[PDB]
Amino acid sequence: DPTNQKACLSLLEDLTTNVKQIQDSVLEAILSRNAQTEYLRGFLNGQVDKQNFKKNVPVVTYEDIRSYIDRIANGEPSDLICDRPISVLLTPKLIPLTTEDLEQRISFSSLYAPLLYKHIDGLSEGKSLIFYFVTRESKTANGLMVRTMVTSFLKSDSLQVSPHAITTCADTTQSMYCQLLCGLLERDNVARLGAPFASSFLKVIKFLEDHWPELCSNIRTGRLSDWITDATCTSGIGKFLTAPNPELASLIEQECSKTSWEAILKRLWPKAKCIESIITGTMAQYIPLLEFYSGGLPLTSSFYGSSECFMGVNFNPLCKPSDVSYTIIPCMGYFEFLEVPVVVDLVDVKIGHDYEPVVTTFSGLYRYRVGDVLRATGFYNNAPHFCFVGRQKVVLSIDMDKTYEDDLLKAVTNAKLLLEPHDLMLMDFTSRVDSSSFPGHYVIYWELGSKVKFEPNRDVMEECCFTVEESLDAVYRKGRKNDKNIGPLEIKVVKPGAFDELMNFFLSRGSSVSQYKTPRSVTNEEALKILEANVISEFLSRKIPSW
Numbered sequence: 001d002p003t004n005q006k007a008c009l010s011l012l013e014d015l016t017t018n019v020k021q022i023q024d025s026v027l028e029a030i031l032s033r034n035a036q037t038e039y040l041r042g043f044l045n046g047q048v049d050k051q052n053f054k055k056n057v058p059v060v061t062y063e064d065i066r067s068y069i070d071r072i073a074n075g076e077p078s079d080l081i082c083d084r085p086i087s088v089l090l091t092p093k094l095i096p097l098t099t100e101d102l103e104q105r106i107s108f109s110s111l112y113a114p115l116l117y118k119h120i121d122g123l124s125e126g127k128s129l130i131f132y133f134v135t136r137e138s139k140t141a142n143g144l145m146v147r148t149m150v151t152s153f154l155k156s157d158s159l160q161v162s163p164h165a166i167t168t169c170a171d172t173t174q175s176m177y178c179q180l181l182c183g184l185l186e187r188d189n190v191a192r193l194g195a196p197f198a199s200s201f202l203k204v205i206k207f208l209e210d211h212w213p214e215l216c217s218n219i220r221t222g223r224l225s226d227w228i229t230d231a232t233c234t235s236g237i238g239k240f241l242t243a244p245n246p247e248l249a250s251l252i253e254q255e256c257s258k259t260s261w262e263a264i265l266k267r268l269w270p271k272a273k274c275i276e277s278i279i280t281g282t283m284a285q286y287i288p289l290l291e292f293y294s295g296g297l298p299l300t301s302s303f304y305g306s307s308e309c310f311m312g313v314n315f316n317p318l319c320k321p322s323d324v325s326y327t328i329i330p331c332m333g334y335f336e337f338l339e340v341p342v343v344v345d346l347v348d349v350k351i352g353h354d355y356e357p358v359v360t361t362f363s364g365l366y367r368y369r370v371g372d373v374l375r376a377t378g379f380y381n382n383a384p385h386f387c388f389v390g391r392q393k394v395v396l397s398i399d400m401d402k403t404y405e406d407d408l409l410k411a412v413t414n415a416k417l418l419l420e421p422h423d424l425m426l427m428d429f430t431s432r433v434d435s436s437s438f439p440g441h442y443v444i445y446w447e448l449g450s451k452v453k454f455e456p457n458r459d460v461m462e463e464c465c466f467t468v469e470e471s472l473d474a475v476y477r478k479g480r481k482n483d484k485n486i487g488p489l490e491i492k493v494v495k496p497g498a499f500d501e502l503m504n505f506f507l508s509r510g511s512s513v514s515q516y517k518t519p520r521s522v523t524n525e526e527a528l529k530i531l532e533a534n535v536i537s538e539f540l541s542r543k544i545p546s547w
């Protein structure tokens with residue numbers, strides 16, 4: 001929060017030690033400044049203490065305060081919800097952001113950065129090759145900016161391989177190509193690789209897999225592709241491309257031509273010391289693929305965050321992906337936790353319990369529920385750990401059964417092992433409820449790839465079906481064995497890149513390449529048309545689970 005430079009910052013130690021006191025001061029400030037705002041005044045008539053806050057300010061989801069956002073979106077002053085002015089709305093839910101909040105988030109990334117260098121060796125020797133892409137932005141009925149967390153961040157170079165001109169290119173395909181082409185030219189000075197999310201990084205790699213001949217023609221030739229037409233991208237890359245380089249292009253041609261893409265990330269960027277991308281929550285689905293390309297590079301997730309709030313860091317970057325735990329940053333805002341009618345302070349949180357973060361914010365959110373489940377796993381200093389379980393919203397439900405993101409993540413994780421004996425792997429997956437049969441049943445869509453022209457093994461695929469069911473909750477398995485209101489589960493296999501076509505579908509509906517996440521459930525009849533369109537084979541569970 002205050003004034004840190006870039007010598008040594010033991011603030012990391014103060015923040016994580018005076019947690020109880022730093023949190024009381026954050027709450028004291030929000031209630032004090034915002035005491036005269038329509039939202040906060042209505043519940044507390046100028047009261048500024050925690051005990052009145054916990055009695056009379058309700059714990060809310062996004063629905064409840066949408067009217068306030070819509071009003072500000074529609075030109076009413078920021079004092080409905082926020083003292084300071086509202087700099088942007090972020091993206092279909094729109095979240096108010098204030099400059100001062102934005103700059104606090106960025107300031108924290110700077111102060112956290114010396115911790116990374118101590119923990120992973122040689123991170124300081126070179127620049128990052130981390131892929132961000134901006135999104136087309138809007139403006140309200142009045143002139144309020146509407147943007148993306150990534151886009152908002154980016155509007156603000158020393159340590160990135162890619163010149164700012166290029167990452168800010170309006171066209172994300174051209175920018176990916178060009179960020180790829182700069183990082184190839186500068187492989188010798190790349191000390192890490194990344195993207196915000198594991199899946200976004202894999203998207204880039206796939207791109208490299210399908211566009212590495214043209215990249216390498218461009219390096220030999222020394223002349224750019226004319227698929228890339230934006231002036232910024234073209235001018236911006238002149239500094240990088242310069243003189244023809246046949247030996248490097250041959251050196252790259254050598255790695256991409258091989259029969260396996262195993263360890264390609266180590267072979268292309270031999271000096272990279274880690275891969276930075278989020279591998280928690282749904283993003284654990286992509287660890288097997290990432291590990292396969294990593295060539296033993298460590299996988300590090302460091303940040304847990306949201307439009308609403310910047311919550312926690314991984315103070316243990318080099319750990320098992322299966323053991324990441326994020327430490328709530330006590331000065332980002334006032335954190336409560338709803339066990340899962342009991343809500344609890346950051347300090348009172350009990351280890352091994354599942355909570356949903358409930359935040360109060362410097363940009364107009366009061367006791368706001370984030371929509372995620374966390375499990376308290378311990379303390380970094382005096383500051384609590386949590387591990388990410390999943391989004392807290394049911395993903396599938398035929399009737400009484402409720403399946404959540406995590407227990408479906410587990411059930412697929414368990415099941416996809418039975419694939420791995422024939423060098424086959426589950427690329428991505430999603431689901432829906434089929435109310436068309438009587439009884440209804442679950443449907444999982446599996447896109448298979450391989451580490452190498454293959455066909456699903458029918459006997460294996462029906463044990464994949466069974467293994468999902470067997471991992472689901474007692475209420476499901478009882479529906480199937482006893483109540484007979486749940487039909488045999490079904491896995492549909494989809495053409496490769498079916499999931500990319502699902503993605504592009506949601507991009508043309510306002511989503512962002514950088515912030516995208518594959519839905520583990522799909523109701524949008526929109527997206528079902530695509531999924532069924534890419535279906536090749538279907539299998540059913542032939543055994544009945546047990547309960």
Ligand SMILES: Nc1ncnc2c1ncn2[C@@H]1O[C@H](COP(=O)(O)O)[C@@H](O)[C@H]1O
Binds near residue numbers: 305515
């Ligand atoms: N480190 C992380 N691990 C798992 N999930 C995350 C992490 N950071 C962000 N997310 C998810 O991304 C959401 C942020 O929403 P958005 O504003 O669409 O990026 C969070 O509420 C989480 O569900």
